[PDB]
Amino acid sequence: SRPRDCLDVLLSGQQDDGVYSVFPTHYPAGFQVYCDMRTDGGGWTVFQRREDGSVNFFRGWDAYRDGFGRLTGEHWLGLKRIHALTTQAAYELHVDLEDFENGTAYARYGSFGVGLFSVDPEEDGYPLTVADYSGTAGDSLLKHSGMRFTTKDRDSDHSENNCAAFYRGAWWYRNCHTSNLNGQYLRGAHASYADGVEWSSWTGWQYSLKFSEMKIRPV
Amino acid sequence: SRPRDCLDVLLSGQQDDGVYSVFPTHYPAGFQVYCDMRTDGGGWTVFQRREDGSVNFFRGWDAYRDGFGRLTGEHWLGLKRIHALTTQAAYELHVDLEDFENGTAYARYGSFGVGLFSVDPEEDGYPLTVADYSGTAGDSLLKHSGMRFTTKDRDSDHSENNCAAFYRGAWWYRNCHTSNLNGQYLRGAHASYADGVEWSSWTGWQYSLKFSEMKIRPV
Amino acid sequence: SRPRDCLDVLLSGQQDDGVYSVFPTHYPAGFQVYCDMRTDGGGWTVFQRREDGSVNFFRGWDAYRDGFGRLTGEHWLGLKRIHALTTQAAYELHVDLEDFENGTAYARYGSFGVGLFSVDPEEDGYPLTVADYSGTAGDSLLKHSGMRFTTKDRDSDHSENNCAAFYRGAWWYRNCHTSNLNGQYLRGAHASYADGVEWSSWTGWQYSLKFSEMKIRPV
Amino acid sequence: SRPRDCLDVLLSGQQDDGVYSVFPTHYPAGFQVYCDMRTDGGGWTVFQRREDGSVNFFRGWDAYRDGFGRLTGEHWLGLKRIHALTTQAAYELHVDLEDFENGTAYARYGSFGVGLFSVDPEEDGYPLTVADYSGTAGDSLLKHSGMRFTTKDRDSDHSENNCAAFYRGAWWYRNCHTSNLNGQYLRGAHASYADGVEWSSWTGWQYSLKFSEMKIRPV
Ligand SMILES: *[C@@H]1O[C@H](CO)[C@@H](O)[C@H](O)[C@H]1NC(C)=O
Ligand SMILES: *[C@@H]1O[C@H](CO)[C@@H](O)[C@H](O)[C@H]1NC(C)=O
Ligand SMILES: *[C@@H]1O[C@H](CO)[C@@H](O)[C@H](O)[C@H]1NC(C)=O
Ligand SMILES: *[C@@H]1O[C@H](CO)[C@@H](O)[C@H](O)[C@H]1NC(C)=O
Ligand SMILES: [Ca+2]
Ligand SMILES: [Ca+2]
Ligand SMILES: [Ca+2]
Numbered sequence: 001s002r003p004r005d006c007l008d009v010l011l012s013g014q015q016d017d018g019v020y021s022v023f024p025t026h027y028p029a030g031f032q033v034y035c036d037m038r039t040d041g042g043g044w045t046v047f048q049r050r051e052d053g054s055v056n057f058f059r060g061w062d063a064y065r066d067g068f069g070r071l072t073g074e075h076w077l078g079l080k081r082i083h084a085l086t087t088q089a090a091y092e093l094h095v096d097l098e099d100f101e102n103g104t105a106y107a108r109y110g111s112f113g114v115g116l117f118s119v120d121p122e123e124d125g126y127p128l129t130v131a132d133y134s135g136t137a138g139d140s141l142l143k144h145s146g147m148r149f150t151t152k153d154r155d156s157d158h159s160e161n162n163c164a165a166f167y168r169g170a171w172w173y174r175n176c177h178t179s180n181l182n183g184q185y186l187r188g189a190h191a192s193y194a195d196g197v198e199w200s201s202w203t204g205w206q207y208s209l210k211f212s213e214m215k216i217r218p219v
Numbered sequence: 220s221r222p223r224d225c226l227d228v229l230l231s232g233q234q235d236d237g238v239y240s241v242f243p244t245h246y247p248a249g250f251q252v253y254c255d256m257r258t259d260g261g262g263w264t265v266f267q268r269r270e271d272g273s274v275n276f277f278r279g280w281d282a283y284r285d286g287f288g289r290l291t292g293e294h295w296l297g298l299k300r301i302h303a304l305t306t307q308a309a310y311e312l313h314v315d316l317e318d319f320e321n322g323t324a325y326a327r328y329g330s331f332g333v334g335l336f337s338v339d340p341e342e343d344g345y346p347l348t349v350a351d352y353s354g355t356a357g358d359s360l361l362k363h364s365g366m367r368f369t370t371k372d373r374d375s376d377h378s379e380n381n382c383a384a385f386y387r388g389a390w391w392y393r394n395c396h397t398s399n400l401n402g403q404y405l406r407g408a409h410a411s412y413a414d415g416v417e418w419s420s421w422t423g424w425q426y427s428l429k430f431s432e433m434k435i436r437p438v
Numbered sequence: 439s440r441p442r443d444c445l446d447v448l449l450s451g452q453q454d455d456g457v458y459s460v461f462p463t464h465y466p467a468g469f470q471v472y473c474d475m476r477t478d479g480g481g482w483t484v485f486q487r488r489e490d491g492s493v494n495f496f497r498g499w500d501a502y503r504d505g506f507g508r509l510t511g512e513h514w515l516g517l518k519r520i521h522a523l524t525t526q527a528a529y530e531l532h533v534d535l536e537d538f539e540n541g542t543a544y545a546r547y548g549s550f551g552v553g554l555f556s557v558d559p560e561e562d563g564y565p566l567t568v569a570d571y572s573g574t575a576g577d578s579l580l581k582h583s584g585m586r587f588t589t590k591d592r593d594s595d596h597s598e599n600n601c602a603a604f605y606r607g608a609w610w611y612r613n614c615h616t617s618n619l620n621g622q623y624l625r626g627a628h629a630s631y632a633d634g635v636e637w638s639s640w641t642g643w644q645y646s647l648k649f650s651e652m653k654i655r656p657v
Numbered sequence: 658s659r660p661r662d663c664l665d666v667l668l669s670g671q672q673d674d675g676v677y678s679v680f681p682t683h684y685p686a687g688f689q690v691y692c693d694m695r696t697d698g699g700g701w702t703v704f705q706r707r708e709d710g711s712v713n714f715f716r717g718w719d720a721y722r723d724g725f726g727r728l729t730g731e732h733w734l735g736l737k738r739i740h741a742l743t744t745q746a747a748y749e750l751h752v753d754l755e756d757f758e759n760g761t762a763y764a765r766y767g768s769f770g771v772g773l774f775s776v777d778p779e780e781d782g783y784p785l786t787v788a789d790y791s792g793t794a795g796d797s798l799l800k801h802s803g804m805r806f807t808t809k810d811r812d813s814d815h816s817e818n819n820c821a822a823f824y825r826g827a828w829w830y831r832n833c834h835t836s837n838l839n840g841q842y843l844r845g846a847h848a849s850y851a852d853g854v855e856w857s858s859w860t861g862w863q864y865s866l867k868f869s870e871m872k873i874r875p876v
């Protein structure tokens with residue numbers, strides 16, 4: 001009756017992609033999420049999706065903490081929820097990407113987590129944990145491992161300036177990034193540098209992807 | 220022991236109209252509500268009631284989010300509670316109205332919801348979901364489908380100005396409305412335009428109703 | 439394992455007065471309270487106690503809402519907790535008083551409640567519900583029935599001024615009071631008017647009591 | 658399935674030191690903590706650790722209330738959590754210390770608690786309860802019994818000034834202290850007076866320890 005994530009939902013007999021209620025160990029009130037029941041067997045809990053630029057992603061700290069957008073469309077689940085999910089078990093991360101030319105690619109990471117051992121994940125900046133890459137999109141996230149999450153109004157990166165403001169996004173910026181999936185929906189090639197929905201290892205630093213979806217599943 | 224709404228309360232053997240405790244899926248602490256155990260079989264959870272103008276409804280955003288008034292009289296349950304209720308299952312909406320001339324009418328909607336797929340229903344403005352009308356009061360709500368909730372201190376309507384301020388209420392304003400049940404208790408016909416407890420399809424834009432009650436029941 | 443109040447604690451086999459954990463229906467996290475297991479059979483949950491003036495009771499709204507002092511001594515449980523307790527069942531109120539001359543008296547009320555039907559008890563001012571007096575101290579509370587709770591920084595009384603500020607306390611002031619148990623610990627007779635720990639029906643308006651304890655038990 | 662502390666975790670079959678989920682009686686959502694499963698039989702819940710000066714401990718009131726640092730390294734669990742743990746049962750405290758010269762020592766207290774009978778532990782300043790010393794480090798905490806917790810931005814000590822600011826730490830200061838484990842990581846002997854990680858009874862007032870760990874276990 002109380003699935004902890006989309007894998008529990010799947011194993012309980014629910015095979016259709018869609019919105020379901022999940023109840024993380026330390027977030028007993030629970031919340032709704034979009035479940036991908038098809039990718040590599042299914043059971044993936046989505047936490048980010050870009051697909052048409054209908055939602056503004058250049059948001060501040062509170063928004064990235066609490067989440068925004070809609071589960072059936074573009075959205076960000078919220079770092080407080082992502083933390084609740086990834087700390088209750090060992091999760092893997094799957095990232096699906098799509099360009100404006102019919103092309104698709106993906107990146108899988110054997111281990112993924114946010115603020116895994118932080119006493120206060122929010123004050124600690126929801127530090128990223130990620131490793132073990134494999135896929136077709138190439139790795140554009142391993143360099144971000146260990147970095148705190150930075151937004152336009154809360155700098156915690158390794159740059160002299162605010163990477164989030166400079167690259168119009170919100171991410172576990174270093175100095176500054178190799179991936180920027182929460183960047184501006186610029187739609188394809190653009191002159192501005194690395195400030196769109198980027199995944200450098202696949203499409204470079206001046207090409208804003210058409211679609212992106214970040215999801216997790218217990219290892 | 221833990222009814223999720225008034226229908227569960229009814230099915231458990233409670234047949235008297237009154238105040239009962241309910242526990243929505245994602246609001247485990249629960250809260251009290253007024254249950255209508257008579258209308259069309261009973262089991263309706265009330266979330267709004269106007270009946271004598273004793274309570275001020277020209278309130279701000281926090282009040283409409285958290286609720287105000289008293290369960291045994293005029294009140295607004297609060298968008299956070301209405302959201303908790305309508306997202307846990309598919310609900311229908313029933314609206315009972317009464318004028319100052321002994322007359323009554325009602326409007327039933329096969330589907331009703333608030334912020335159904337919003338990651339953060341409050342930030343998303345508790346968007347309205349409603350469809351499938353039937354009744355005697357006529358439909359004065361379908362045009363509001365998809366609109367966010369707007370209050371005098373938080374504009375999210377499709378008007379150049381603030382509909383909530385202009386029509387002294389709080390509603391899922393468009394530009395501006397066909398219904399305004401949270402408007403001023405003006406008592407019958409009035410010169411001011413559409414700023415009373417209106418249900419245009421039944422009594423027009425210049426007649427403030429004597430009674431209104433909005434309630435929901437699982438489809 | 440989860441007593442809802444001190445009566446449940448008593449009925450479970452706990453006969454010693456003391457501090458115990460209770461879990462109100464709509465406050466599942468629970469909290470600790472002092473239980474009186476001797477008065478008229480025992481099972482009373484204490485919510486207020488004055489006994490030596492060691493604690494300041496001239497506090498603001500947040501303090502009276504959340505509570506202050508210590509369970510083993512002078513304290514105020516907090517209106518949010520008192521509300522959680524009195525709305526889960528029908529409770530009676532018992533008030534024990536003591537003067538500085540060895541004398542004692544008590545007042546019992548067959549029904550007692552705070553914000554019983556308020557959608558938002560805090561915004562509604564935790565309105566008092568009380569009736570059916572009997573005892574030796576005389577009735578000094580029935581006149582306060584229906585009044586909202588007023589503090590020095592939140593006026594909701596029927597006076598032109600702030601009763602709480604004027605009589606240095608916090609109570610369900612009318613205009614202004616017949617009882618003021620949260621008043622200043624003035625110790626016996628005093629020149630200032632009605633601004634001490636008063637229970638007018640027993641000791642008048644210019645005598646601050648030595649001891650007072652307010653507690654509840656399911657009817 | 659719901660251990661209340663690390664002793665429950667141990668008794669359930671978990672013998673490895675590490676991070677585990679615990680669920681205090683009045684903090685049902687639960688949280689993670691580091692468990693010491695080796696010291697004197699194991700089952701100790703850690704709430705403070707200093708080991709390399711990588712974390713800033715000169716923090717304000719909110720930080721000491723909510724916690725900071727990481728469970729696998731230097732951290733402070735947070736007074737709200739320590740309170741939730743120590744009020745659910747009778748706990749003993751164990752303090753392990755280490756200097757920069759290979760030396761180690763410890764202090765054990767038969768009884769330990771924070772804000773044990775406070776209606777609102779935070780407003781009451783999380784008062785310290787501690788007694789019954791035994792060990793090799795000597796007692797440097799008994800004098801602090803009964804004192805409230807003081808930080809650089811919230812003075813509640815018995816000093817004319819702010820002990821926390823003066824001795825660059827956060828503690829249950831009196832006037833001012835005999836122990837200062839949350840002080841500056843000064844690394845050994847230092848000229849400044851008593852403003853490092855001190856445990857006076859063992860190493861004096863001008864020697865900042867290399868390691869310290871504070872943990873609790875049910876008596
Ligand atoms: C191209 O896009 C279409 C539309 O989604 C999709 O069905 C197809 O699999 C994609 N790839 C190719 C090679 O057509
Ligand atoms: C008129 O109002 C009365 C009073 O509530 C009610 O009993 C009655 O059913 C209403 N309708 C008619 C036709 O009397
Ligand atoms: C007077 O006070 C004492 C002390 O608490 C108490 O034992 C006694 O019952 C009181 N009443 C009388 C008549 O002594
Ligand atoms: C000295 O430090 C080492 C390193 O941690 C430790 O193994 C040893 O037990 C300590 N004491 C002595 C006497 O070596
Ligand atoms: Ca920076
Ligand atoms: Ca507008
Ligand atoms: Ca007044």
Ligand SMILES: [Ca+2]
Nearest residue numbers: 812816818819
């Ligand atoms: Ca001081």
